[PDB]
Amino acid sequence: MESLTLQPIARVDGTINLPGSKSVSNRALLLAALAHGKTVLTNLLDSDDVRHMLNALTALGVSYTLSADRTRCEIIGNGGPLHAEGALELFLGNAGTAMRPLAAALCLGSNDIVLTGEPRMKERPIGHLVDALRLGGAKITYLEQENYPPLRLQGGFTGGNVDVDGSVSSQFLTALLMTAPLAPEDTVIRIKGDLVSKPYIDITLNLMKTFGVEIENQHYQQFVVKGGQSYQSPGTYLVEGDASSASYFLAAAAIKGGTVKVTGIGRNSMQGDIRFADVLEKMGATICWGDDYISCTRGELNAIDMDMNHIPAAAMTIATAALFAKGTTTLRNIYNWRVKETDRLFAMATELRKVGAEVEEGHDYIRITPPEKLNFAEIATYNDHRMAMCFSLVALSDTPVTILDPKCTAKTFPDYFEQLARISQAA
Numbered sequence: 001m002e003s004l005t006l007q008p009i010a011r012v013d014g015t016i017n018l019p020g021s022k023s024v025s026n027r028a029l030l031l032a033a034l035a036h037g038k039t040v041l042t043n044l045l046d047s048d049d050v051r052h053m054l055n056a057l058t059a060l061g062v063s064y065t066l067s068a069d070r071t072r073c074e075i076i077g078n079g080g081p082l083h084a085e086g087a088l089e090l091f092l093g094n095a096g097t098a099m100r101p102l103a104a105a106l107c108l109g110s111n112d113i114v115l116t117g118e119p120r121m122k123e124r125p126i127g128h129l130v131d132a133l134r135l136g137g138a139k140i141t142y143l144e145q146e147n148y149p150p151l152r153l154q155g156g157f158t159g160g161n162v163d164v165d166g167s168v169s170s171q172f173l174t175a176l177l178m179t180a181p182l183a184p185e186d187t188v189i190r191i192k193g194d195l196v197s198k199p200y201i202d203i204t205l206n207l208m209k210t211f212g213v214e215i216e217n218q219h220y221q222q223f224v225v226k227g228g229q230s231y232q233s234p235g236t237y238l239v240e241g242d243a244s245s246a247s248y249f250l251a252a253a254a255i256k257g258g259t260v261k262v263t264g265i266g267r268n269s270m271q272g273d274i275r276f277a278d279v280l281e282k283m284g285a286t287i288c289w290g291d292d293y294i295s296c297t298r299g300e301l302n303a304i305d306m307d308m309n310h311i312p313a314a315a316m317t318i319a320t321a322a323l324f325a326k327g328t329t330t331l332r333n334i335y336n337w338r339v340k341e342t343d344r345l346f347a348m349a350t351e352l353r354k355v356g357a358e359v360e361e362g363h364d365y366i367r368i369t370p371p372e373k374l375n376f377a378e379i380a381t382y383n384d385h386r387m388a389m390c391f392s393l394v395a396l397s398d399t400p401v402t403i404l405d406p407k408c409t410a411k412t413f414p415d416y417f418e419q420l421a422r423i424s425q426a427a
């Protein structure tokens with residue numbers, strides 16, 4: 001068991017050029033692979049989730065080249081649905097943005113492919129997506145627990161009337177949206193009830209349009225898609241910096257700045273997590289917006305009580321930032337934290353108490369009352385990059401913190417600790 005100990009950080013200040021967005025990167029790679037023509041992606045993220053998508057594309061026969069730092073990728077589009085037979089196994093780590101989208105996309109035409117991943121991925125739900133794909137004609141088999149990967153895909157999604165549950169993950173709808181345009185028949189996707197993580201759907205539609213396809217969005221309750229379309233290379237495409245990864249650095253400034261500026265995202269970003277900056281502002285920090293940067297400057301930090309369903313990833317960062325705020329913070333409507341890299345409500349509550357907070361772990365919310373002063377803890381990270389990054393903020397205090405399995409940040413941000421160190425100042 002590897003670990004990293006962070007000594008107290010007296011002040012943070014500086015500029016971070018953000019690693020590429022994981023959400024945009026994996027959507028762009030799959031759309032580029034399906035598209036006609038050569039796509040050149042720049043500012044692509046190099047992290048485990050992207051690497052698993054790249055390996056899957058290699059396995060499927062897609063040709064591409066990567067620059068030395070793996071942030072520039074020249075992809076030769078397949079000009080249509082990807083194919084493989086013989087129950088070829090694609091190992092997808094714990095990448096939801098590879099597992100959910102490929103589970104749908106590979107249902108086009110005939111195929112015989114198995115999708116699997118790390119143990120935790122076999123515990124992340126996918127039944128709502130499988131139900132929807134089957135309504136459209138796909139043949140899908142659960143090889144282990146019903147409603148979870150691994151899956152054996154045998155093709156057959158032709159389109160039609162498809163209902164999909166949007167209450168647990170927006171990724172199921174995302175996967176259907178990217179797939180349906182290439183199906184032979186038109187598809188009408190009806191959302192059953194609620195839709196969580198709605199901003200990620202806007203990221204999907206934005207990327208689909210960049211690749212030549214638009215659909216009819218009826219108030220997010222129903223989506224009308226014309227079949228028989230084709231994705232087309234947009235030529236060179238710049239991947240946005242990752243707004244979820246930015247959250248740690250902006251929160252660091254709100255706690256212990258200084259001014260921290262992150263570049264690669266700005267007021268025009270398509271990512272929902274730039275709204276994390278509005279939460280810091282509500283807590284008392286000062287935010288500056290640019291075309292290609294967001295900056296945060298220390299002001300004060302007051303507790304808040306907010307529904308965080310629109311920024312589930314960055315919301316975790318408020319849970320540790322809350323340790324430094326005045327008052328009790330409550331984060332609501334975040335049930336799906338439970339079905340991600342780990343059950344994040346259980347994990348966040350457990351680790352927060354270790355550094356001294358009094359915490360109520362609600363079924364779909366968390367309430368945090370900070371201690372007068374933090375104490376040292378060895379933080380468990382649950383194979384979850386975000387637990388490691390969130391708890392790194394404990395060091396913006398008088399106490400060091402030890403983070404177990406620090407390399408788990410590689411899921412989306414291999415260089416996280418060096419980047420936090422870059423803005424950490426002793427004076």
Ligand SMILES: C[C@](O[C@@H]1CC(C(=O)O)=C[C@@H](OP(=O)(O)O)[C@H]1O)(OP(=O)(O)O)C(=O)O
Pocket residue numbers: 022023024094095096097098168169170171174196197200312313336340341386412
């Ligand atoms: C969970 C995480 O990020 C998810 C990425 C994502 C997307 O479509 O790009 C949508 C959200 O999932 P949901 O709709 O289920 O809330 C995010 O939480 O990772 P993932 O890609 O493995 O699912 C994360 O990085 O924290």
